[PDB]
C-alpha cells in the first residue's frame, strides 16, 4: 500500500512496516506493507490486495508493535483522522471514548 | 472493539491490546484492538469489523502474548466466563478439561 | 510452499521460514512455510494451500521479520523480481517508487 509519505510520517509509519488494512465499505481485512508515496493525498493499494478494495473505499490503517509491560505503560498511540481528500483533520495521542 | 472496562480489567486486557474475536454464530474470525468502555456490560464492535458480526452474537475474545520457555512454565491464563448480560460467571487460571 | 532453493537463497528465505503468499490472479492471501526445492524454477504449493491457488497463477511471496528501531534504520529489504519461468530478472535492496 502506497501512502503519501507526509501522511505516513504523521502516523509514524516507516517504509516496509507491516500494517493491517480494514475496509469499511466491504469489510475486507488484510495485511500488507507500507510504501512511501510522493503524490499528495495518495493511498494506492497495489498487487493482489487491489482485489480486496475499490477506489473510493473508506479504510482504517492499523500499525501494531510488540511491547513489554513498561513500554505499554508509557505508550501513547498516534491516531490520525483524515478527510475525504486524505488531508489531516486530527492527530491524537490517546483513544477516543 | 469497545469492552466494558471492568470486564476488560478482569480479563487483564489493556487498552490498545490486539485481540482475536471469533464469532460462534457465524464463524467469523478477525483481529482488532481493545477500547475501554464506560457502559456496563457493553461490547461494541466498531469500524469495518461491524460487518463481521450481528448484535446479539456470542463471541470468544482471545488475547495472546509472546512468551519464552520460563514464562510458559509459570504462566496462568485468565479465563473469564460471562452470562447473556456480559456479567461475570467465572474466572479461572487454568484451562478446562 | 516448495521454492527452488536457489531462488529462495537469493530472497534470503530459510527452510521453515513463515511467508505470506498473495495470489494476484484470485486475490487469496495465506501464510505457510518455505520448503527448499531441488527443481529449477519450481514453485509448488502443497497441502491445504493448494486449494487457494491454480497452477499458472502469479503470486507475491513476502517474508517479514520483527525488528527494533536500530535494526529498522539499518535494514535493506531483498526484493527479487522474476520472469514467467521464475528466472531472476532483478534483485534490489530498496523499495520502488
Amino acid at each position: 500500500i502506497t501512502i503519501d509519505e507526509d501522511l505516513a510520517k504523521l502516523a509514524k509509519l516507516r517504509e516496509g512496516m507491516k500494517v493491517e488494512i480494514v475496509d469499511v465499505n466491504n469489510g475486507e481485512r488484510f495485511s500488507t506493507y507500507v510504501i512511501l508515496g510522493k503524490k499528495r493525498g495518495e493511498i494506492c493499494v497495489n498487487g493482489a490486495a487491489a482485489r480486496k478494495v475499490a477506489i473510493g473505499d473508506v479504510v482504517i490503517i492499523l500499525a501494531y508493535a510488540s511491547m513489554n509491560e513498561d513500554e505499554i505503560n508509557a505508550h501513547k498511540p498516534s491516531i490520525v483522522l483524515v478527510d475525504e481528500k486524505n488531508e489531516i483533520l486530527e492527530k491524537g495521542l490517546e483513544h477516543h471514548h | 472493539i469497545t469492552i466494558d472496562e471492568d470486564l476488560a480489567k478482569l480479563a487483564k486486557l489493556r487498552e490498545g491490546m490486539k485481540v482475536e474475536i471469533v464469532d460462534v454464530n457465524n464463524g467469523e474470525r478477525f483481529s482488532t484492538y481493545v477500547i475501554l468502555g464506560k457502559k456496563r456490560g457493553e461490547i461494541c464492535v466498531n469500524g469495518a469489523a461491524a460487518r463481521k458480526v450481528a448484535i446479539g452474537d456470542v463471541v470468544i475474545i482471545l488475547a495472546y502474548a509472546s512468551m519464552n520457555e520460563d514464562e510458559i512454565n509459570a504462566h496462568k491464563p485468565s479465563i473469564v466466563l460471562v452470562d447473556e448480560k456480559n456479567e461475570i460467571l467465572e474466572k479461572g487460571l487454568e484451562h478446562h478439561h | 510452499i516448495t521454492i527452488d532453493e536457489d531462488l529462495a537463497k537469493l530472497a534470503k528465505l530459510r527452510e521453515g521460514m513463515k511467508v505470506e503468499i498473495v495470489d494476484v490472479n484470485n486475490g487469496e492471501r495465506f501464510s505457510t512455510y518455505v520448503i527448499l526445492g531441488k527443481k529449477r524454477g519450481e514453485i509448488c504449493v502443497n497441502g491445504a494451500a493448494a486449494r487457494k491457488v491454480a497452477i499458472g497463477d502469479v503470486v507475491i511471496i513476502l517474508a517479514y521479520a520483527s525488528m527494533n528501531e536500530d535494526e529498522i534504520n539499518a535494514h535493506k529489504p531483498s526484493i527479487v523480481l522474476v520472469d514467467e519461468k521464475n528466472e531472476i530478472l532483478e534483485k534490489g535492496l530498496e523499495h520502488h517508487h
Binding site: 493525498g41 482504517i60 483522522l81 475525504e84 | 491490546m17 | -
Partner: peptide, 24 residues
C-alpha cells in the same frame, strides 16, 4: 513477555487508486 499493541493508525482514509499489476 510481549503483547501486540496498537502503535498508530490512520482512521477512515480514502483509497485513491489501485494497481493490481504493480511492479516492484
Amino acid at each position: 513477555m510481549t503483547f501486540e499493541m496498537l502503535y498508530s493508525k490512520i482512521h477512515r482514509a480514502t483509497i485513491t487508486d489501485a494497481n493490481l499489476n504493480y511492479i516492484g
